[PDB]
Amino acid sequence: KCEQVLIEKHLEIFHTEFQNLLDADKNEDLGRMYNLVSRIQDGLGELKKLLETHIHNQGLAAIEKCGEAALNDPKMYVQTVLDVHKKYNALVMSAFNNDAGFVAALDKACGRFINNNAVTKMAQSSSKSPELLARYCDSLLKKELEDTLNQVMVVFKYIEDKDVFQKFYAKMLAKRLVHQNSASDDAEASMISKLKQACGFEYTSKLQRMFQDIGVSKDLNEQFKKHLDFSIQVLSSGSWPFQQSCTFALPSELERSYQRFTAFYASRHSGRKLTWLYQLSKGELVTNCFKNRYTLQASTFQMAILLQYNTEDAYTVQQLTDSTQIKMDILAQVLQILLKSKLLNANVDEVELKPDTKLYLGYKNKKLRVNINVPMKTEQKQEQETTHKNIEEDRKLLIQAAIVRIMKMRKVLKHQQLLGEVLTQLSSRFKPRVPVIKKCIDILIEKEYLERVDGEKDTYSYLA
Amino acid sequence: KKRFEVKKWNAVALWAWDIVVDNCAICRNHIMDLCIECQANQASATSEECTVAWGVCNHAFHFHCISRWLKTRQVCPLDNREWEFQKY
Amino acid sequence: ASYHISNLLEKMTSSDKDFRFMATNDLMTELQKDLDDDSERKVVKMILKLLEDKNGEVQNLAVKCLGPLVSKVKEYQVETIVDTLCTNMLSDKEQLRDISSIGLKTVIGELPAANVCKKITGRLTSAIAKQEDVSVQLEALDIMADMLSRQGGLLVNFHPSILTCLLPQLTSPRLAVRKRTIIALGHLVMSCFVDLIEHLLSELSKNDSMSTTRTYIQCIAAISRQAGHRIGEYLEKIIPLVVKFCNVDDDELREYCIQAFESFVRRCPKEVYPHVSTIINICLKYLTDMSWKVRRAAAKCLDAVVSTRHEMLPEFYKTVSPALISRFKEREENVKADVFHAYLSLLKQTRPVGETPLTMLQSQVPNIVKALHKQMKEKSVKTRQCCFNMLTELVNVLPGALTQHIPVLVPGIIFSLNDKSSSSNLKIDALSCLYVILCNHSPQVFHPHVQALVPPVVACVGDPFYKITSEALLVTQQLVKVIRPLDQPSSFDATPYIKDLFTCTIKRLKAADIDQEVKERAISCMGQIICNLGDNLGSDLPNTLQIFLERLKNEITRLTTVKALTLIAGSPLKIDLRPVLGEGVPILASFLRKNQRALKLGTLSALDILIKNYSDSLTAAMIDAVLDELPPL
């Protein structure tokens, strides 16, 4: 009775106060109000709805505040998201006493405004969040820190698109393994152990396969050096996401290493060759003609281009093209980087490279050893869309395989049930669309996998 | 006119079977080129989805060719064992 | 039915990858929903055989199904499954070991019986013993940690054995093993029986006499964090050890700072604060690299001191703690941010529920602004945001503090606002700080800065970002009252600012599908301008006022419009509203029908004030309509 006279009659008056207590940080007031409203029956749904609305509004405001910066900066956005998530979690635990019905509200709210936000609208795709997460993870892994990994793992559960994130993480791990610049093995082991619980088993098996492949490369290299300033990695194309290297002619000084090792391979393995890759290769050269000795690192194409400067002063781009065998786009991309490096006009950036057009005696730097290998200006975007297309193709193939295996078991299945089985079987990975699932049935049908039953359409049967 | 020397070098290479990489065992056409099923007709909507499928045995096989071969016999004809998909 | 399970089992060894992924899925679905002993044994055997396969998808599906399988089964099946999983875990195959570990973890998670846990713990105790292999040791440690995290009530008579088996792992050459065993010990400390904690503490105390090994300190910190109420009785034997070890030359004070902070946060009762306060003060000062994170830890250690303890506020004020905190404001960003956070926490703790803390704080105020003056010239947005937050907090805790510093602080605010590289967050923080300063300061110390504060505010008003526009509108509304306060006399020719301030405001009056907050802020600013500077406006006063009528129809800006009308009606200045009275009063009468307490009160007050101020211009027509809504009120 008392609860009906001191709380019930004024519930509306309390409601307007709730928002007033959310704008300003007052944990004691929220706790007292929750304790008061707990005694009342069916009087908590409105509070949960208001809390969810406030959480969504605050998240949208935070994401919009850092607009036009989160697209290429996966650090600040992730930091803000984690800070907001932890703040809300602490507020719920302390004020609401970690109520069962309130933790779900925050979970659904996060799952709602993480996928869709200003970044998603600007990028015109919901896969930007996993991309930023993968980039941030790679940044942390590449050169006390376990707290961030746990935060990323717990917040990652709200991400619906997991295949894109897994593919990006695999690509980053492969890139880091190819170019040895990792921080420590303990961090990698901890990350693998943490991902074992979240990700499935195929991903872990592939990562272990890559690890053993690189180990075999390392011990083969050490055995080769023992048998005899030259290290080459031998990896498997099937278990590593790398494409075939384009046409390229080896220089003179590097020819010897290409021959002897090949012979060493002939006596070790038969029926298999090696596909040398140069886009990922690197080297180092030393010069002394300057006022001081310089020890600089570069890529294979860069050393090949420079190594043409013996017995010459200046060149034409075409002789370069016909002597180095490099495509015009890559040749121009390398040449503009070299010009920016002040190693080879009014202005170097954004100046046309005209096939008709030497090294300048300069490049005065305080550091004895200087690294010039840097990512290209546009290769990042090209890699982005090509990886996105590959992921889309893999998703389509996986959907086709799932449909085929579902229909194999059932001799004759309805069209409606078939789309529920496909959605529920792959829901853990992604949420395929219905316009997208339709095409695949047609392609399967076009390839004689299935037959719409003769009596009526929208019933499919499996015919061998 | 300058002296440019090299001290060390790092390279990356990939190993694969020659007999399968140079030409697919099922289809005698070039792997990069369209398959026989895709070459017979070009207006079909399935002509842009034929790609190279790899496996544990590091063998290259066309997607359509391997899919059709898996109907009757599931063991790979080269190593005589269970074929598995790794990438495309 | 029996035939269903029989055919499922027959099709499970099908030799087709897709016929062994459908049968397993069907079995999982059937087991999930709410089976003879022979069928149970057969399905368990088939699942165990299939757990090791040449495909990852089927292996993962079987591992997932292992969870629900134990949910409905007798005890012997679980015992044999655990036994076979443990035996397989000892195999040299990495894949099989990982599969067994994942299955055991899933089984442990599925569980909330006792015999199974005892056997598992015994197997882990036997396996964790010193062995050449490390992978099995790490897997066993992970399984034990997961079990302790999940279950910590049973196995009372097994804690000594676990502690004895885990102790040798502390001196393992691998730092990962040391961290894992420290975490496992911390988790197990919660489960424990009570007699073991004393033995562990004594062993750690006697082992503290060691060479340069930070594992013992890390374990001590972990156990203190996991349980502080059970270690408060042994601080006299731990504090001296760390105090003496702090004199070492190697950079290892980080652990001492971390454990001191943990003790301060968790264990409130103690009287050793001054003993370590001087040590922390001297540690934060020295600098000579790996010397920045030690400074960061030293700075963060004072956070607990300034937050938890409150009765010791005056001794903090009299000591050199705030002096050093303010002095160390020209260092790298990582430590500067933590110093700012610590002093913000101190200021927050200053506010309570010979000389009072407020009086002492004011005496040091002149030493803060100067220290922040140079910070206003830094190009880092983080430093500017921290300075703005500090100024806002200082103004909020006690007004009237920054009275003789406006001339030296306004230029910094203008420079920060005019900077193009400033982000939206920095501009928002600067505007909020300016608004707080204006709302908590005398108007008499802002007249000279009007010429330097009106142009930037007007410029900020024209911003595509809506929050910045709202902040600029709020600043303009505050400045309208500050420049011409009607409560006290003033003498300042503000006429030159009448046009631009209006121009930036009237332009925002026309919403045209804009954010609701922007509309409300614009309406409030227009109402305040009309109420205050109503006489200055010429022929643009009536027409714009008509727009208010358009705001009385939509419910989005009804309360704001009513409040603005009420505020305008009550003011010393005489504002002509008659043209909107005959058409305005009836509309208000329509707000008394809908059930809205706040709206009803607002409209009643507006009508009352309008009638009181404007009684000569009235008509019985609208009066009759207004009177019709009284009987039901």
Ligand SMILES: [Zn+2]
């Ligand atoms: Zn084809």
Ligand SMILES: [Zn+2]
């Ligand atoms: Zn083929």
Ligand SMILES: [Zn+2]
């Ligand atoms: Zn094969």
